[PDB]
Nucleic acid binder design. Structure first.
Ligand SMILES: Nc1nc2c(ncn2[C@H]2C[C@H](O)[C@@H](COP(=O)(O)OP(=O)(O)OP(=O)(O)O)O2)c(=O)[nH]1
Ligand SMILES: [Mn+2]
Ligand SMILES: [Mn+2]
Length: 425
DNA sequence: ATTATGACGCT
């Protein structure tokens, strides 16, 4: 009863840019705005691989990781923007720079954890406390939440439903208790409306967000109402929400572990997990995963929002699938050089912008017919930002994979250079 | 012949 902590200490938001690469291209080219459109990489093989889809195109069934020529069969009016190509590979620079615009706006409100190029977590606990004090008892007006959904409401036209749910929530609110978790979530959501308005004002980009008490719930909430909307998942909404929530929808359970939870326990939904003791879960899935599952199915997670706006590693990758796999020494060298040249550019810009130097180079390769995604990974020292030296060292470090008697065998289907181990500069 | 990344756990 009084001693079961309920994981309501924090207010955490997950902000995700709606179809981010597509919006970047639509800002740059107005002819694409408010249309079925997608962003592709390469163009020769089946029109190119789609990596981002507007919501208009999604309504036709167009999805990420689909060939453009097939997408065109579903959506013949589909419009396509192409990723920039430099040194024979995809160059994502435009999107990393748009991402930094967004992150820098978010950082004005609260400390953020860059979780990917287009999404960040936000620790709003301090911001909510400050804002609650600033209100000094004033009740929260629906006008302050024009795009917020309250999950699980209403109980007992889409915008009409949204407003009814919000009204039920706000009418039920106890504004005089500065320590009510539900009030804290609500003020968090007001702040998130303000953040999303500033992002759209200053970049043109729209986003969705989730507001809850931890990262996993915030992330799950963000996806409930997209695009251009935000969702508040309260502690109290967890039993009903989780009672039909497939386990695979929870962050980190979408893969093998989630499938084994399903297979070993004989269950389907997150909420069914409540019926197992902590020890049972640890027995099946190990101590860490067991404790984490026991708390997560009750809506409780303690992973902190890390104060980290910048990526921890800077990486350059290219697949050489099918018959394009690299089969000679000259080929492996020339592509290591192309990769090292993009890496040098990104690293020099990173050192100037962010006052830090990488110190370790990681080289990863895949060989043709190898089951694994990394056939090998080896590290060496990264001492100067010189593409010729980094490519020479990556070769020096992988070359004993060749089994030829100037040829290269097994042919290489992936090269990957990653600068890691940053130190302040 | 989804690709290009990037965080993090295990041992
Ligand atoms: N190169 C590459 N980029 C990807 C890949 N997956 C996603 N991206 C890019 C394009 C996306 O806009 C962005 C973030 O991906 P998300 O999963 O958040 O989807 P997206 O933002 O496109 O749409 P949504 O958030 O659902 O509105 O990162 C990928 O596999 N390869
Ligand atoms: Mn997104
Ligand atoms: Mn995202």
């Amino acid at each position: 009863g009084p001693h079961m902590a309920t994981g309501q200490d924090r207010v955490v938001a997950l902000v995700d840019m709606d179809c981010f690469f597509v919006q970047v291209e639509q800002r740059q080219n107005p002819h694409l705005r408010n249309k079925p459109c997608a962003v592709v990489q390469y163009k020769s093989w089946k029109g190119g691989g789609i990596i981002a889809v507007s919501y208009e195109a999604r309504a036709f069934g167009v999805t990420r990781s689909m060939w453009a020529d097939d997408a065109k069969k579903l959506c013949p009016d589909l419009l396509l923007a192409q990723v920039r190509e430099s040194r024979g590979k995809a160059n994502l620079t435009k999107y990393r720079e748009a991402s930094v615009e967004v992150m820098e706006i978010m950082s004005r409100f609260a400390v953020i954890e860059r979780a990917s190029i287009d999404e960040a977590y936000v620790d709003l606990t301090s911001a909510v406390q400050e804002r609650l004090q600033k209100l000094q008892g004033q009740p929260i007006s629906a006008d302050l939440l024009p795009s917020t959904y309250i999950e699980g409401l209403p109980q007992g036209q889409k915008e009409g439903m949204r407003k009814q749910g919000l009204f039920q929530w706000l009418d039920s609110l106890q504004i005089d208790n500065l320590t009510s978790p539900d009030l804290q979530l609500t003020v968090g959501a007001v702040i998130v409306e303000e953040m999303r308005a500033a992002i759209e004002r200053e970049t043109g980009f729209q986003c969705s967000a989730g507001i809850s008490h931890n990262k996993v719930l915030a992330k799950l909430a963000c996806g409930l109402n997209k695009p251009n909307r935000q969702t508040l998942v309260s502690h109290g909404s967890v039993p009903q929400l989780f009672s039909q929530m497939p386990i695979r929808k929870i962050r980190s359970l979408g893969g093998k572990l989630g499938a084994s939870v399903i297979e070993i326990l004989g269950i389907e939904y997150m909420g069914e997990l409540t019926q197992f003791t902590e020890s049972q879960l640890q027995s099946h899935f190990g101590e860490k995963n067991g404790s984490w599952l026991y708390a997560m199915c009750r809506g409780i997670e303690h992973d902190p929002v890390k104060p980290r706006q910048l990526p921890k590693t800077i990486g350059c990758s290219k697949n050489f699938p099918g018959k394009t796999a690299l089969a000679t020494r000259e080929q492996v060298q020339w592509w290591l050089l192309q990769l090292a040249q993009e890496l040098e550019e990104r690293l020099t810009k990173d050192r100037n912008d962010n006052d830090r130097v990488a110190t370790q180079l990681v080289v990863s390769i895949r060989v043709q017919g190898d089951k694994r995604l990394s056939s090998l990974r080896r590290c060496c020292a990264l001492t100067r930002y010189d593409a010729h030296k980094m490519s020479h060292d990556a070769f020096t470090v992988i070359k004993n994979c060749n089994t030829s008697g100037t040829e290269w065998s097994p042919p290489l289907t992936m090269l990957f250079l990653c600068a890691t181990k940053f130190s302040a500069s």
